Amino acid sequence: RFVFPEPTADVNYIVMLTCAVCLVTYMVMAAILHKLDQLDASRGRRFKYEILVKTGWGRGSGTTAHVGIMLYGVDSRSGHRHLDGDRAFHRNSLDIFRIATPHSLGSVWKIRVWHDNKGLSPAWFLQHVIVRDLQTARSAFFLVNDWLSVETEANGGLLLRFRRLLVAELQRGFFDKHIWLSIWDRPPRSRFTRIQRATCCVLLICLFLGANAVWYGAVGDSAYSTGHVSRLSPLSVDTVAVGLVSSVVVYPVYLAILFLFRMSRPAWCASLAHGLSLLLVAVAVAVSGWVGASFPPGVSVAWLLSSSASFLASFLGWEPLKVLLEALYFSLVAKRLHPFLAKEEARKVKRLHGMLRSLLVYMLFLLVTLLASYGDASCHGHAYRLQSAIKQELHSRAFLAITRSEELWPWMAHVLLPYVHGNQSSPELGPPRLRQVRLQEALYPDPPGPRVHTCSAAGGFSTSDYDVGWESPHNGSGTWAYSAPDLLGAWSWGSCAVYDSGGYVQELGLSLEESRDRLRFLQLHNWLDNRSRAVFLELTRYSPAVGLHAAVTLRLEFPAAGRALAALSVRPFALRRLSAGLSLPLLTSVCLLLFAVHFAVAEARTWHREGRWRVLRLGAWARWLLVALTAATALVRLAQLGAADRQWTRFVRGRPRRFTSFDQVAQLSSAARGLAASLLFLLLVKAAQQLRFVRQWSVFGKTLCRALPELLGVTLGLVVLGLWGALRLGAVILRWRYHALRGELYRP
Amino acid sequence: DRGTRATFIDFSVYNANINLFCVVRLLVEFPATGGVIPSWQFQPLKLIRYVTTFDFFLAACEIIFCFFIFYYVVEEILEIRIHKLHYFRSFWNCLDVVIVVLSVVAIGINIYRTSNVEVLLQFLEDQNTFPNFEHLAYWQIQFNNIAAVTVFFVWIKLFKFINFNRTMSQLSTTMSRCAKDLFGFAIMFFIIFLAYAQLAYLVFGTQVDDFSTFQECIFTQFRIILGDINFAEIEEANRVLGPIYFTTFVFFMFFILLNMFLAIINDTYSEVKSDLAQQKAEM
Amino acid sequence: FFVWIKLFKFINFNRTMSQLSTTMSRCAKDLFGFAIMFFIIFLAYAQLAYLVFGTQVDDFSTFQECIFTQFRIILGDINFAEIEEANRVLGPIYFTTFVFFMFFILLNMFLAIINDTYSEVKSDLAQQKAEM
Amino acid sequence: FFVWIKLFKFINFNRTMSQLSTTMSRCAKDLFGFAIMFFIIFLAYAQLAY
Amino acid sequence: FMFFILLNMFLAIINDTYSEVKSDLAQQKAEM
Amino acid sequence: LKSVLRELVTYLLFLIVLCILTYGMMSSNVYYYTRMMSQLFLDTPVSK
């Protein structure tokens, strides 16, 4: 069922962005992992208490004695001890255990004795190095004190039955062979190098992405799951199923390289595996990028969900299976029986681990924000061209250049009426309106000429009902009702007064003859002749070729009789509704909320753990800004979706004689991407700030931070005095601090 | 009708007074959202080149240029296997390869565009039909671009041979020693630059025209740095984020992050002069 | 013009004016040395612009016009509306690289040279006069 | 205006990082000595242009 | 001569004054 | 160091007094009277 569609010349941005993030998060992770495993390579050669271990009972011990202790327990693993010293259990001599063994459980079953008799095997009795209490008291003061033999073994609590072999094999490789969370649990003296775990992980990620991409669009004729019935919402029968099917298929290719890194110190294939994996990653990215370009917008979300389910299957039920089967194999086949400066090194390792586990969260957040912003960054050019075409076709300059109030009738006579109705410009989507405001405060003409530019005669607004011409009730309510403003959608931000969605409105007709008849009827019956603050002509538009709307608003307001202040605005937007399912904006608006909650809980935890006086500290303010911005971005988009759905329903209810004023949706849709475009700015700035970790490039940020107070002081002084190219003080102020920090960095 | 998407007009002229053709193309394209976008192109070709003595002189110059490129190819490949290999941390041997490659590409393009001239003879046989010269006018443009870039790089290569005294060696060393620091700071500069560019593109990129595309945002920001464009049109695009973007961009990219280049260059020059002066103070 | 210039010979007896004139005198060899490096790049850029835009922009129609247009760009008197439409590639590349390599890199060497020479001249003059 | 000037003068006598930028007014004997060798050239060029 | 040679002496004078003021003020602070 | 700020009490009191005087001297009846006089006469159409 393999097909060769190539049906479009467009590009899908979701797949490209996902692959780019999944590759950058591997490059940076590999750099950090190399900088970390250098330590393991150079080091491969306090629960344990350094209590008095003076040995005076083991006699007749002339041989090379080696001790191996494994402190098995909750997140603890140990090894042998270096027998280097003056005697170090030499001929007819004893020794004590004193090494750097940080992994050791507490008062739990942590006992394992391995005695190696290199050379001779002299019979002696050395019980143990008893420990009572120094820091954590990992054990007690007791020992079986077995005799000396040829590589004897001893086990204790706080080859035999399977109950010990299986447990030992499981615990040894439970988080060692689980390659996902194995980067943080590399066993010392292992040749798997911790830098080729990150290669297999990214290989699995890109293979999942490639398989899911090739399944969607190419193999879609045997199940017909292509758009029309492939509901992007989780059916739990075709998304997770495809994820599992894609996950199982990759392993026969993944396992052929994972087994090749291990057991390869088997001659030199370790470097060949790297090249093979980097070729597979490249081909898997290329095929996805070429195939997904034909994805309709409604299937990329399904692809993302399927890939996420695929990864989660290879993490909670496929890798534990592999370690369990491998442990059962080793416990059933071959009967294997063998499974002051240091503080600064521990601190460095902890810092590197924190960096490593924060980088992934930052990259996930960056991916979510990028999909929220540029997930639909293909309607931007179309929107710009659509607004430009509407403005040049509607003669904008010929409109707002009018200066007197009766040019409006010729204006609607020659350009507006041919535009609204006719064999051309068919997509209209609703008749126009002429909702005008009154001001109730008819004003005499102002002194002609240069004005004070300040709005004058600011009075009240008329609200009562009137009749044809003006106020003349005969029996009941008037025929020119006020049409009270709607709750949602208003506030055009007038030149000298904020308006709303209320005012006396006309319908402008539906055909040429009736439209012109109505225009004449209202013109010769004193409609726009009185005070007549503003007119507010605004209709709509729709564009089916691209799938975009536009809210058109033409404002003509008269602060003073005689002067015509005109303005216009075309706001293109895409009408996407909340009832459309699980569209991408709904997916990334319920994901940013999770990140906002995570940041809020991880920051409010500090105040109950650090107390007060955290104010005035920049870290306690630049983090509460991120929570507010993320919540605002996630909430404005949801409000826009709800508003669009409500407006569309209200429209379809009464289309032939309704207007429905889609401008509120156009404003909310502008704000939503005005907010999600600033959060990405903060993320990029933080990415720039995180460049300080290179040794020789760490001075720029420090110089800027140190010299910022003086620059602000100088700017404040200049402001108080009330340009810069002549007496350049920024250059010298930065130069002095740069020299000082370079000096303090060079010689020490 | 409404279904048309583009419309082209093509013709050409000769002007026998100076032997120089000129092909003309006029394009108006009607997007699917309405409107018309006109465009034009005038290209003065020359297809009967071998007419005068100066043409023969120029042909001889091209032959000499080809011989020089062959000589440079052999004298650069002599310093690969006979001598040091992977000596690419020099920037003066990573620039000769660029010149040689561009010159070879230019020679190939010229041979291709002058070896397929059958359109002129075909038209000259029957002179009542449309002369199809639209292909030659494309290769002429490509040849012009390649030749211009090659000339620029050949002129840049002159810096290798100006070290005749101390006052020039000092400047060359000052330029060479601050290249790494400048490269280190340029990344941090351009990350924030691109962040501003994308913010402008997403916010204003629909109603301003100057930020209509990403490239336009980049060029507009460069012109802001030059102090060319003013914010008279940004403000009405967005009342709230109009002035904030302009003032904050100017503040943080005109005398805070723009002065670091000056600081680095001044400090490095002072250090280099001090070191070479102290080196002489022991004779 | 030259008669007005020659006045510097006489007001150079004031100590501050003497210091300023000495600063000009002892950095004139470095400024002229760097002027060659500046103008080689300037002429390369000008000739590239002449070859690319030389038939469509009327500011690059001849070589000296390219020179003067670049000098005007340094002050910030560019239009860029017809450079981009003349050539959509090599039109913006030329402009961006020229602006970067002149405003950010090359024009700061003059400032560095003048500042360093002035500082060392003042230090030497003060130290020499302090021996009295 | 006198009160504002007195406040500005007191700001000059405030803590560091703002007094550093007003002690530079001690060496105003050069900023005047430079402006007299900058207007000789300016008038020479103006006369040539005229 | 007015953009490369004469507008930079002004900045040079300002920078030298600032450097001297900072240096002797810091020396005074270090001594007392 | 504290002696310098010991004498700042007089300066602070003088600044507060000056600010209070500026606030209290910028009220109405100073320019409002002039505006009312200009509206009543000396700026108006004498004849209809």
Swiss-Prot record, chain A:
Residues 216-240, 296-297, 372-586, 642-669 are extracellular. Residues 34-194, 608-620, 691-712 are cytoplasmic. It comes from the Eukaryota. The chain crosses the membrane at residues 13-33, 195-215, 241-261, 275-295, 298-318, 351-371, 587-607, 621-641, 670-690, 723-738. It is found in: Cell membrane; Cell projection, Cilium; Endoplasmic reticulum; Golgi apparatus. Residues 47-158 form the PLAT domain. Glycans are attached at residues 423, 475, 530. N-glycosylated. Cleavage at the GPS region occurs through a cis-autoproteolytic mechanism involving an ester-intermediate via N-O acyl rearrangement. This process takes place in the early secretory pathway, depends on initial N-glycosylation, and requires the REJ domain. There is evidence that cleavage at GPS region is incomplete. Uncleaved and cleaved products may have different functions in vivo. Component of a heteromeric calcium-permeable ion channel formed by PKD1 and PKD2 that is activated by interaction between PKD1 and a Wnt family member, such as WNT3A and WNT9B. Both PKD1 and PKD2 are required for channel activity. Involved in renal tubulogenesis. Involved in fluid-flow mechanosensation by the primary cilium in renal epithelium. Acts as a regulator of cilium length, together with PKD2. The dynamic control of cilium length is essential in the regulation of mechanotransductive signaling. Belongs to the polycystin family. Component of the heterotetrameric polycystin channel complex with PKD2; the tetramer contains one PKD1 chain and three PKD2 chains. Interacts with PKD2; the interaction is required for ciliary localization. Interacts with PKD2L1. Interacts with PRKX; involved in differentiation and controlled morphogenesis of the kidney. Interacts (via extracellular domain) with WNT3A, WNT4, WNT5A and WNT9B. Interacts with DVL1 and DVL2. Interacts with NPHP1 (via SH3 domain). Interacts with BBS1, BBS4, BBS5 and TTC8. Interacts with RGS7. The LDL-receptor class A domain is atypical; the potential calcium-binding site is missing. It is linked to Polycystic kidney disease 1 with or without polycystic liver disease: An autosomal dominant disorder characterized by renal cysts, liver cysts and intracranial aneurysm. Clinical variability is due to differences in the rate of loss of glomerular filtration, the age of reaching end-stage renal disease and the occurrence of hypertension, symptomatic extrarenal cysts, and subarachnoid hemorrhage from intracranial 'berry' aneurysm. This is Polycystin-1. It comes from Homo sapiens (Human). The lineage of its organism: Eukaryota, Metazoa, Chordata, Craniata, Vertebrata. The gene is PKD1. The chain holds residues 3063 to 4120 of 4303 of the full protein.
Curated annotation (Swiss-Prot), chain C:
It is found in: Cell projection, Cilium membrane; Endoplasmic reticulum membrane; Cell membrane; Basolateral cell membrane. The chain holds residues 567 to 698 of 968 of the full protein. Residues 66-80 dip into the membrane without crossing it. The lineage of its organism: Eukaryota, Metazoa, Chordata, Craniata, Vertebrata. Forms a nonselective cation channel. Can function as a homotetrameric ion channel or can form heteromer with PKD1. Displays distinct function depending on its subcellular localization and regulation by its binding partners. In primary cilium functions as a cation channel, with a preference for monovalent cations over divalent cations that allows K(+), Na(+) and Ca(2+) influx, with low selectivity for Ca(2+). Involved in fluid-flow mechanosensation by the primary cilium in renal epithelium. In the endoplasmic reticulum, likely functions as a K(+) channel to facilitate Ca(2+) release. Detected in fetal and adult kidney. Detected at the thick ascending limb of the loop of Henle, at distal tubules, including the distal convoluted tubule and cortical collecting tubules, with weak staining of the collecting duct. Detected on placenta syncytiotrophoblasts (at protein level). Strongly expressed in ovary, fetal and adult kidney, testis, and small intestine. Not detected in peripheral leukocytes. A motif (Selectivity filter) lies at residues 75-77. It comes from Homo sapiens (Human). Residues 8-31 are cytoplasmic. It comes from the Eukaryota. Ca(2+) 1 binds at residue 75. This is Polycystin-2. Belongs to the polycystin family. Phosphorylated. Phosphorylation is important for protein function; a mutant that lacks the N-terminal phosphorylation sites cannot complement a zebrafish pkd2-deficient mutant. PKD-mediated phosphorylation at the C-terminus regulates its function in the release of Ca(2+) stores from the endoplasmic reticulum. N-glycosylated. The four subunits in a tetramer probably differ in the extent of glycosylation; simultaneous glycosylation of all experimentally validated sites would probably create steric hindrance. The chain crosses the membrane at residues 32-53, 89-109. Changing residue 118 to A: Abolishes increased channel activity due to a gain of function mutation. It is linked to Polycystic kidney disease 2 with or without polycystic liver disease: An autosomal dominant disorder characterized by progressive formation and enlargement of cysts in both kidneys, typically leading to end-stage renal disease in adult life. Cysts also occurs in the liver and other organs. It represents approximately 15% of the cases of autosomal dominant polycystic kidney disease. PKD2 is clinically milder than PKD1 but it has a deleterious impact on overall life expectancy. Residues 54-65, 81-88 are extracellular.
